[PDB]
Design an enzyme around this catalytic site. Structure first.
Site, short mmCIF file in Angstrom:
data_model
loop_
_atom_site.label_atom_id
_atom_site.label_comp_id
_atom_site.label_asym_id
_atom_site.label_seq_id
_atom_site.Cartn_x
_atom_site.Cartn_y
_atom_site.Cartn_z
N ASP A 118 -5.78 3.86 9.34
CA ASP A 118 -5.44 2.85 8.35
C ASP A 118 -5.92 3.20 6.94
OD1 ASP A 118 -4.21 0.59 7.39
OD2 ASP A 118 -5.84 -0.74 8.02
N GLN A 122 -7.96 0.80 -0.98
CA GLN A 122 -9.06 -0.15 -0.83
C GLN A 122 -10.21 0.39 0.06
OE1 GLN A 122 -7.72 -3.68 1.17
NE2 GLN A 122 -5.65 -3.72 0.29
#
Ligand SMILES: O=C(NC1CCNCC1)c1n[nH]cc1NC(=O)c1c(F)cccc1F
Length: 274
Positions: A118, A122
Site C-alpha cells: 500500500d 502519505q
C-alpha cells in the site's frame, strides 16, 4: 503503554490512530500507532526488518486487546512535502534521490519476501538529512493500486510495490497524481486510457483474470512524452518499465537501481519548514 505521554494526534487511518508521543522515562519522541496471534507473529517479523529506508519499529506493545506499535518519529511525509513544493516542484536531483532510496528500501523488503502492498505519498516519511523511508507496512486511496490487484489477482507479487512507486515518481515529476481513480473501475479505466487497454499481446493471461471483462472498452495507448513531461529519456525509460502491465515483465527494485537514470544520483537535502 502508560509509559508514554501523548503530544498530538498526527493522523487517523484504516488500521488505527497515529500519535506523536514521548517516552515518559527515556524522553524519546516517537510515533505511537494505536490498533483497535498470527498478526502478532507477522508484526514481530517486522521488528527484524531493519533498513535505513524503512521507518524503524522500536517496540510492539500488546496489552488488553489493544496493540501499540512504537515507531521512530519523522517530521514530515511526502504528501505534505509535495503539496508544499507545488508552486515550484520538487527539484529533479531530489526526486531522483528519493526514488533511489525507496528502491533500496524495496529491494531490501522484497529480498526478505516482504511486500508493502500500500505505498502512497502519505506513508513515505522524510527528515532534514535527505532521507526518505517506507512506513505503514501492510476512503481508501486506489490511486497507486497495481492493475493485477484491481483485476482480482489474489496472489500478487512484489511487482505491485514497483507499480505504486512508479505512480509516485510520475506524481513528483508532474505535480499531479498519475491515475486519480475514485472507484475501482474508474481507477482501472484511468490506467487503460493512459497505458492502453491491456490484452494478451502485452499481458499474457490477462483475459483470464477474475475481474477481467471482455466488455472493457478498448483504448489505445498514449506516449510517455505526453505523460510525464519534461522528464528526460532515462527517467521516462525507467518509469515505463515500472509501469509494465505484466507483473513478470515489470522491473524489479534491484534491476531498477542499475538503471542509467541513477548514474548521476546524489543526496540533496530538502528545505523543510517544521
Ligand atoms: O506520521 C509520522 N510523522 C508525521 C509527523 C507530522 N508531520 C507528518 C509526518 C510518523 N513518524 N514516524 C512514523 C510515522 N507514521 C507512521 O508510521 C504511519 C504513517 F506514516 C501512515 C499511516 C500509519 C502510520 F503509523
Amino acid at each position: 503503554m502508560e509509559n508514554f505521554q501523548k503530544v498530538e494526534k498526527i493522523g487517523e487511518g484504516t488500521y488505527g490512530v497515529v500519535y506523536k508521543a514521548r517516552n515518559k522515562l527515556t524522553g524519546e519522541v516517537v510515533a505511537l500507532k494505536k490498533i483497535r496471534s498470527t498478526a502478532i507473529r507477522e508484526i514481530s517479523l517486522l521488528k527484524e526488518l531493519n533498513h535505513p529506508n524503512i521507518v524503524k519499529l522500536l517496540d510492539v506493545i500488546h496489552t488488553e486487546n489493544k496493540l501499540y506499535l512504537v515507531f521512530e518519529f519523522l517530521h514530515q511525509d511526502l504528501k505534505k512535502f509535495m503539496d508544499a513544493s507545488a508552486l515550484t516542484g520538487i527539484p529533479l536531483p531530489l526526486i531522483k534521490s528519493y526514488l533511489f532510496q525507496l528502491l533500496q528500501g524495496l529491494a531490501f523488503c522484497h529480498s526478505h519476501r516482504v511486500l508493502h502492498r500500500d505505498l502512497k505519498p502519505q506513508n513515505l516519511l522524510i527528515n532534514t538529512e535527505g532521507a526518505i523511508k517506507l512506513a505503514d507496512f501492510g476512503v481508501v486511496t486506489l490511486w497507486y493500486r497495481a492493475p493485477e490487484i484491481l483485476l482480482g489477482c489474489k496472489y500478487y507479487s512484489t511487482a505491485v510495490d514497483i507499480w505504486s512507486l512508479g505512480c509516485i515518481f510520475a506524481e513528483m515529476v508532474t505535480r499531479r497524481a498519475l491515475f486519480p481513480g475514485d472507484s475501482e473501475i474508474d481507477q482501472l479505466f484511468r490506467i487503460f486510457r493512459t497505458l492502453g487497454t491491456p490484452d494478451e499481446v502485452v499481458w499474457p493471461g490477462v483475459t483470464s483474470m477474475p475481474d477481467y471483462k471482455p466488455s472493457f472498452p478498448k483504448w489505445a495507448r498514449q506516449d510517455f512524452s505526453k505523460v510525464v513531461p519534461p522528464l528526460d529519456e532515462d527517467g521516462r525509460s525507467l518509469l515505463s518499465q515500472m509501469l509494465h502491465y505484466d507483473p513478470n515483465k515489470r522491473i524489479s527494485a534491484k534491476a531498477a537501481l542499475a538503471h542509467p537514470f541513477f548514474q548521476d544520483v546524489t543526496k540533496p537535502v530538502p528545505h523543510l519548514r517544521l
